[PDB]
Ligand binder design. Structure first.
Ligand code: HEM
Ligand SMILES: Cc1ccc(O)cc1
Length: 137
């Protein structure tokens, strides 16, 4: 289930992180409004950009930590407040996070692997509820 999915994603995190984030940017092209350096670049070109690989993996690194600390797919309030208060997130609303978790769950449901797609769906909704509670618009 959810806990095994964290271990599976962590066992190949750079490539899962990049392919899920590319799924998100391709599904929601207007979301490049917060990613000006990613515009006018194919999937392969983005993969060759040092900060694309590094930033994307660091994001999924912390995402996996937030999931690991969660209970029944409900993140800690402290993790939610970190995500609201990060200066890198100053621009964001909960909608940005919903769209990311929509792309993550579609990625898992298209995988041949037995991802607990439903647990990840609840996690993204629970995370959006916690982000809202912690003061994200
Ligand atoms: C659970 C979800 C998320 C986690 C755990 C997370 C975590 C992080 C982390 C660790 C960084 C620092 C990266 C670095 O400096 O190497 C970061 C930066 C950033 N995050 Fe998030 N993030 C999440 C969701 C989002 C979403 C949905 C958006 C926008 C749609 C977003 C936009 C950004 C931006 C714009 C930066 C800074 C620019 C960049 O690193 O390219 N984040 N985030
Ligand atoms: C979600 C994300 C991915 C990459 C990045 O550079 C910033 C944010």
């Amino acid at each position: 289930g959810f806990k095994q999915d964290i271990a599976t994603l962590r066992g190949d995190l750079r490539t899962y992180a990049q392919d899920i984030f590319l799924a998100f940017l391709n599904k929601y092209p207007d979301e490049k409004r917060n990613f000006k350096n990613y515009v006018g670049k194919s999937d392969q070109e983005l993969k060759s950009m040092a900060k694309f690989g590094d930033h994307t993996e660091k994001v999924f690194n912390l995402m996996m930590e937030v999931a690991d600390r969660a209970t029944d797919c409900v993140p800690l309030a402290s993790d939610a407040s970190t995500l609201v208060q990060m200066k890198q997130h100053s621009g964001l609303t909960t909608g940005n996070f919903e769209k990311l978790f929509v792309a993550l769950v579609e990625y898992m449901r298209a995988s041949g692997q037995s991802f607990d797609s439903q647990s990840w769906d609840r996690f993204g909704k629970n995370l959006v509820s916690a982000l809202s509670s912690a003061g994200m618009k």
